[PDB]
Amino acid sequence: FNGLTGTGVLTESNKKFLPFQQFGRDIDDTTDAVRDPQTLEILDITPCS
């Protein structure tokens, strides 16, 4: 997504990103949510098993 790489499972989410905000963070300073630049829908990331 938009240059940043990663691996995992994508799921639909219902978070409250501000209009200028692109992605999310976590207590472990790791990516936890993204906003795809085609439909502007919040997306949640789950690690592999």
Partner 1 sequence: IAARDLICAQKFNGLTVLPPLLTDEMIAQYTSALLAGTITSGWTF
Ligand X SMILES: *[C@@H]1O[C@H](CO)[C@@H](O[C@@H]2O[C@H](CO)[C@@H](O)[C@H](O)[C@H]2NC(C)=O)[C@H](O)[C@H]1NC(C)=O
Q: Which residues lie closer than 8 Å to 7 by C-beta, 6 or more apart?
A: 48
Task: Examine residue 30 and tell whether it contacts partner 1 (CB under 8 A).
Answer: yes
CB of 5 to partner 1, least distance (A): 14
H-run or E-run covering 45: strand 42-46
CB of 28 to partner 1, least distance (A): 7
Tell me the residue type at 19.
P
Which span (1-9, 12-20, 22-30, 38-46) binds ligand X, by CB under 6 A?
38-46
- Select from 2, 5, 14, 38 the one that contacts ligand X (CB under 6 A): 38
